[PDB]
């Protein structure tokens, strides 16, 4: 699986995961320096206050 990991709007990026990972993330969340969207390779947990969106494609985490 190949995930993008670029945070927000920056230039695109990726990152190859480790064997046997078939999902990709995208969180997003607001602190008091605006909103941040981190992406990246698997499913974390979900945390309080966190958006997540987990999905199983290749670079399916834009």
Same mark, same amino acid.
Request: some cysteine; overall charge positive.
């Given at each position: 699986? %190949?995930?993008?990991? *670029?945070?927000?709007?920056?230039?695109? @990026? +990726?990152? +190859?995961?480790?064997?046997?990972?078939?999902?990709?993330? *995208?969180?997003?969340?607001?602190?008091?320096?605006? +909103? %941040? %969207?981190?992406?990246?390779?698997?499913?974390? @947990?979900?945390?309080?206050?966190?958006?997540?969106?987990?999905?199983?494609?290749?670079?399916?985490?834009?």
């Amino acid at each position: 699986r %190949i995930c993008f990991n *670029h945070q927000s709007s920056q230039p695109q @990026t +990726t990152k +190859t995961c480790s064997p046997g990972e078939s999902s990709c993330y *995208h969180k997003q969340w607001s602190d008091f320096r605006g +909103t %941040i %969207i981190e992406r990246g390779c698997g499913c974390p @947990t979900v945390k309080p206050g966190i958006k997540l969106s987990c999905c199983e494609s290749e670079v399916c985490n834009n």
